[PDB]
Each structure stands twice: as C-alpha cells, then as structure tokens.
C-alpha cells in the first residue's frame, strides 16, 4: 500500500446559522509525519490499553500526522449587524437548543492513488437555553478582551482518515467518545478600524505550550496505487 497523507486539513467551528465563528485551513509544513518519536510517545500514552494499542499498531508513523491548527480563524467574522444582533438575543433568550458544529475535511492526493479525494465528519453540541456556556458565549459579543467561553468535549483529537469519505473520531482511543473529546476556550479578537474588525480565536482549554495551535492527530489508512 501507498500513503495516503492528508494535503490539507480543514476544519470549522459554527454556531446554529450564523456566518461561521472560525476556520482554518493547515497545509504544509503544518500537517506534520509522525516521527518514530512521535510514535513511540503516542504508543506510551496508550499502553496500558490493548484495544487502543491493537488500532494505534495497524499505523506506521508515516501513516499519521499533526495537524497543527492554527487557533485565531483565518478569516475575519462575516456576519452582517443585524445577525450579529439576532444571535446575540438567540444565545441569551431563546428557548430552544441551539447547535455548536465543528467540522473536519481532509483532503488527499490522488495522483499517490485511493479514489477518494476528501474524508470528513463533524462533531455536534446542543448549547441548551439559559445554559452557563451559552451566556457566557453571549456575554462576549459585548467587548471585553480578557473575558472568554470554555465549552466542554468540542475538539475530537484523534481522527481516522479512511479511504471511504467518512472520518470518524477514533472510537478506540476515545473509548467513551463525546466524554473524551477535550474542551476548547473561545474568544472574541476585536480591532478598532460595526466600528470593529472581528474574529474569533479557539484554543484546547488545557493547552501549555503551544496555546495558538490545536492538534489534531490523524490516522490514514494506506490507499491502492493509481489506476
């Protein structure tokens, strides 16, 4: 078989209709090969769980990579005032749930070989009404550059990248799913010039050393050479 590394990685976070908070798109050099360090690190975290070490030992380090997502969103928050307006009031006073989605789309190669250019998924939340998170959300279209929002099990960190074009998260090192995706801070970036620039800018809620990136590890299985 040949490897199939994802070329580019993008990814999305949105809230219910509104134009989409966040996102991004890695490319090279930011979607890193394991290396047999990487692979040895990956292989102690894991060790002490046979089922997460039977999916991790079907993977050469080529086979997986880093993407390292860069945190601030590449574009500049297109929503028009009176949305901005309509979802501020939404996230306050409505009295239905509203969805928080985080994409994920791998793009592949073809010409390496496989037939399936692009695999993704996504991952949801319902923000239920009058719930902590979904005021806070609110409460940082007002302004203030020190405030922000922790929602809980948003980012999927292990993603396979299959050759069909449904990527899943990685039910074997995220045995209890939702419950094992890692929680993200959000904030609301404003630069003076409807007098404010604005973008927002996500973080993994126990990010150290690296705050301005979220990395998502992603297992390809080998493709076929072309035809």
Not at 16 to 36: D, H, K, R
Not at 99 to 113: I, P, V
Request: proline share 9%.
């Amino acid at each position: 078989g040949v490897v199939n590394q994802p070329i580019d990685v993008t990814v999305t976070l949105k809230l219910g209709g509104y134009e989409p908070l966040f996102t991004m798109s890695a490319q090279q050099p930011s979607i890193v090969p394991f290396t047999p360090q990487a692979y040895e690190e990956l292989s102690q975290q894991f060790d002490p769980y046979p089922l997460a070490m039977q999916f991790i030992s079907q993977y050469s380090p080529e086979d997986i990579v880093t993407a390292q997502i860069e945190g601030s969103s590449g574009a500049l928050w297109r929503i028009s005032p009176p949305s901005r307006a309509q979802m501020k009031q939404e996230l306050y006073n409505g009295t239905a749930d509203i969805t928080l989605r985080f994409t994920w789309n791998f793009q592949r190669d073809l010409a390496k070989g496989g037939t399936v250019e692009y695999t993704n998924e996504k991952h949801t939340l319902e923000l239920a009404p009058n719930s902590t998170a979904r005021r806070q959300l609110a409460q940082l279209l007002e302004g203030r550059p020190d405030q922000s929002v922790v929602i809980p099990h948003l980012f999927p960190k292990y993603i396979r990248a299959p050759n069909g074009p449904e990527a899943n998260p990685v039910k074997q090192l995220q045995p209890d799913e939702e419950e094992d995706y890692l929680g993200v801070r959000i904030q609301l970036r404003r630069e003076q010039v409807s007098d404010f620039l604005e973008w927002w800018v996500i973080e993994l809620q126990d990010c150290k050393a690296d705050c301005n990136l979220l990395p998502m590890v992603i297992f390809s299985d080998k493709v076929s050479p072309p035809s």
